[PDB]
């Protein structure tokens, strides 16, 4: 239907195809259950309201006008659409120039980056998300957020354009790691497009 | 070590037990890391506080004086605790007779007392709880709270003495029930233990 104000976009990669990092279920599970729910429901709860012609990034810049439906489908959906992109099977990607001097300059390297991101990971307390993004004086974060939550929301403390998410709920890694968040937050890095990131990053700055 | 301010309580029966509704990896996983992590934090977090010799119930009570530490795994341990008491692997439990009473006058059956319980935890966004409490006018009302967050803690709107808790954490489902959490809900009412619930309602009464 074309008419519906958002819509999954499809995988660029098979459900198996980031099984060094992630499940081929879990992907499976996570994008056609999880995913797919947050999108339908933000296309019912925005019906009819103020927010049924805004841009997802509008809807979230003035969530706290909108019902919990809207603030928790929308950023579910943001969240995951930007998670999909940021993911790939295809090994060795790494930051472009511009994003490799920015991650060492504000971090000192991109192991160093990786840890702070793992630490934020690990620290956020029931379900979240952790994000590396730009904020509004172009300089790079590392924050996380609770539930749907995200950094283009006006609840959220630290806030930015996120370039880079990776989500901590239970369900993105349960079956393979059970509580071992920390493995998986060490083993994603394997699969990050480090090439959408640093694409993302550079739309930030404009 | 016997001096430990916060013990985990063995586990009434078997990890594989409750099976009829939880699978034994998910048991022994929540027990033996989940639980135990929070039992083992909230030991440390309370060490050189005002908490230290504090009894559970008075730590959550008192909880917004204390750390974010002392909270989630207050609540951790709390939660968790009582979770364990209210399974059981013997089918056929039911509620008291004062229970019973109790719960037709407020919710008119036990099928509408689980209908409710069924809706807020999957009302629930996120991590949390699914509760059964007694209010402090003796009433019963079911809540949910987020993360380990429960109907004891001074902060809490809906406060009251729970007698019955659902972990709608998804550690608590995911590897029986992946995203089907209104299908764990259902089940797990095959597996609650209203002995130990109605224990709990004499004494919270
Ligand atoms: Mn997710
Ligand atoms: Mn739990």
């Not at 195809?17 to 879990?26: N, R």
């Not at 295809?90 to 001097?101: C, F, M, V, Y």
């Not at 793992?118 to 994000?131: D, E, L, M, T, V």
């Not at 790079?140 to 957020?145: A, D, F, I």
């Amino acid at each position: 239907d074309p008419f519906t104000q958002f819509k999954q976009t499809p995988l660029p990669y098979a459900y198996d195809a980031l099984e060094g990092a992630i499940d081929a279920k879990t992907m499976e599970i996570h994008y056609s259950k999880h995913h797919a729910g947050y999108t339908a429901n933000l296309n019912k709860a925005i019906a009819g309201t103020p927010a049924e012609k805004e841009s997802i990034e509008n809807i979230l810049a003035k969530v706290s006008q909108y019902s919990d439906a809207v603030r928790n489908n929308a950023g579910g959906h943001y969240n995951h659409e930007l998670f999909w992109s940021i993911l790939t099977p295809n090994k060795g990607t790494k930051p472009s120039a511009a994003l490799q001097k920015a991650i060492d300059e504000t971090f000192g390297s991109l192991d160093a980056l990786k840890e702070k991101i793992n630490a934020a990971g690990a620290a956020r307390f029931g379900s979240g998300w952790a994000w590396l993004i730009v904020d509004n004086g172009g300089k790079l974060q590392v924050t996380s957020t609770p539930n749907q939550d995200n950094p283009l929301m006006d609840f959220t403390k630290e806030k930015g354009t996120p370039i880079l998410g990776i989500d901590v709920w239970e369900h993105a890694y349960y079956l393979r790691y059970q509580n071992k968040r920390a493995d998986y937050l060490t083993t994603i890095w394997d699969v990050i497009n480090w090439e959408e990131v640093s694409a993302r990053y550079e739309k930030a700055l404009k």
